[PDB]
Design an enzyme around this catalytic site. Structure first.
Site, PDB file in Angstrom:
ATOM      1  N   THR A 184      -1.980   1.824  -6.201  1.00 60.67           N
ATOM      2  CA  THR A 184      -0.950   2.083  -7.201  1.00 60.67           C
ATOM      3  C   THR A 184      -1.441   1.811  -8.620  1.00 60.67           C
ATOM      4  OG1 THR A 184       0.621   1.368  -5.502  1.00 60.67           O
ATOM      5  CG2 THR A 184       1.481   1.686  -7.728  1.00 60.67           C
ATOM      6  N   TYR A 236      -6.669  -2.976   4.758  1.00 59.13           N
ATOM      7  CA  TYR A 236      -5.736  -1.962   4.273  1.00 59.13           C
ATOM      8  C   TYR A 236      -6.024  -0.670   5.025  1.00 59.13           C
ATOM      9  CZ  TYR A 236      -3.112   1.078   1.062  1.00 59.13           C
ATOM     10  OH  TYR A 236      -2.234   1.986   0.520  1.00 59.13           O
ATOM     11  N   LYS A 275      -2.744  -4.562   5.761  1.00 57.71           N
ATOM     12  CA  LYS A 275      -1.698  -3.824   5.099  1.00 57.71           C
ATOM     13  C   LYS A 275      -1.683  -2.436   5.713  1.00 57.71           C
ATOM     14  CE  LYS A 275      -0.604  -1.482   0.715  1.00 57.71           C
ATOM     15  NZ  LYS A 275      -1.006  -1.317  -0.657  1.00 57.71           N
TER      16      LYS A 275
END
Ligand SMILES: [Mg+2]
Lengths: 295, 296
Positions: free
Chosen positions: B46, B135, B164
């Protein structure tokens, strides 16, 4: 200006964690002497993700130096998911004598179609050499739509086509039906002939590392519209074309080159590694039905 | 294991005249801290980590560490790469700049095998002494860290404490925690924050929390306190904004929302990221009308 025909996504041989420059040059000369029309250094098959900028320079310079005096072109991989970096790599590839660049669609960050357009437009305006788009959604996580490819082809003088690795012959029809002047390049060996028979003008091959004469004959048969002979070679190559992807490219092809004695050490850079012992045996068995040219 | 859990925010990286708006970056992190966030994730996906220079990644991590000092908020710095030698260097680089842990995304584009993923993360875990959170986001990387690979890395490497997950696969979330209930499963998909938490997940790394940090924090803390009724209540209320923040690729909608809410000064991305279409711009603005957005 365009770069088409039978092209090879060159593997990058390693010897003790370093680029085997002697093997790299002799592998390119082996491609040249077997009818290959262009070589793609530091592409996806060349493990571009794990090469330093210096090693990319060395591989490109070796490719340019080895191809001088021949018809063989150097289509250097110079893509990035950061546009400012992709522009820098494009200018960097031109400075080292590459005839053109293969610029992969931005990976991981998934730019929109508008962003893909602005990404490639900045790349194309930074150099005066041909730019071939590279769409491989299974690796990048995004797709350059047909409309985006066509817009880039029409708006950017040096963007002359796309290398498609998407398993989507429908899109290949869509591309050439609406813009028959672009150069559609097969980036998927198993369907080299269907792409060529629909108007594709070349391939960027993984199998050509091991069997460059067969991929070259396939391509030129197709370019002369001898589709029977082109399809025959494509059918002959299907088994090796699939076994070279039992694990992620370039794990099987480097294994095959090692098994044929074409590279001296079976070395990858992490996160790439040797295949499983089961896939190692699979590659060794399928290779036995193909005559592998030496040096 | 040393863990980093709770409500976490994948921080956006504001740009002003093409450069990181450091003053705005600090203000946004402080806003997250003041709204109950347990950790911040600088230079993540992000945060447009792909287009940030090495120096800019250092500045963002140090600003996050500096802003979080004196609070309980941890810094889980994004430090992934599809080249193992680089990811090792980025992990050590994150430790040198004060990060409490690293979020290390699965190698993208080059599609390593499960064996390669194991050796990739093992080299990362053996390079630092801070916690490492895996992740997995196959839609972005083109590969998947299998449940067996995650569990092997969790058991064989001391610093790897969880993953994640951003894979839209609640089945895999069951698979992970059923076979290794000691790991920290972290939600990487805001829309299913509660389902992941209700199955034993111990935190989220959120995109929506950039805009609505108080709601994401309350949702996560309700679930951690086993108040699933109130946590789901917030998750259902957040569903519309959670989905519209992905009408275009993250972080295009969230930065658009932050700009529409007056939380950032300019709607600037780094190419190949760009502004959304004018239709999606209106759609985001439309969905935001339902929510109370905290200021500074
Ligand atoms: Mg002829």
């Amino acid at each position: 200006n365009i770069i088409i025909g039978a092209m090879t996504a060159l593997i990058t041989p390693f010897k003790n964690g370093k680029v085997d420059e002697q093997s790299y040059a002799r592998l390119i000369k082996r491609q040249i002497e077997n009818g290959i029309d262009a070589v793609v250094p530091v592409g996806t098959t060349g493990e571009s993700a794990t090469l330093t900028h210096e090693e990319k320079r060395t591989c490109i310079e070796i490719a340019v130096e080895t191809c001088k005096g021949t018809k063989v072109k150097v289509l250097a991989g110079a893509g990035s998911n950061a546009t400012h970096e992709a522009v820098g790599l494009a200018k960097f590839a031109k400075e080292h004598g590459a005839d053109g660049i293969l610029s992969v669609a931005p990976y991981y960050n998934k730019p929109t179609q508008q962003g893909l357009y602005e990404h490639y437009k900045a790349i194309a305006q930074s150099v005066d050499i041909p730019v071939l788009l590279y769409n491989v959604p299974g690796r990048t996580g995004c797709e350059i739509s047909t409309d985006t490819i066509i817009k880039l082809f029409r708006d950017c003088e040096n963007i002359y086509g796309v290398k498609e690795a998407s398993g989507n012959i429908d899109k290949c029809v869509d591309l050439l039906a609406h813009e028959p002047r672009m150069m559609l390049i097969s980036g998927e060996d198993a369907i080299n002939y269907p792409i060529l028979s629909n108007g594709g003008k070349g391939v960027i091959s993984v199998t050509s590392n091991l069997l460059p004469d067969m991929i070259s004959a396939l391509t030129h048969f197709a370019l002369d519209e001898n589709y029977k002979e082109a399809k025959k070679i494509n059918d002959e190559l299907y088994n090796i074309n699939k076994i070279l992807f039992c694990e992620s490219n370039p794990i099987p092809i480097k294994t095959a080159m090692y098994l044929a004695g074409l590279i001296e050490s079976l070395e990858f850079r992490l996160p790439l590694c040797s295949p499983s012992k089961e896939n190692f045996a699979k590659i060794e068995e399928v290779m036995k039905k193909y005559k592998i040219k030496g040096f």
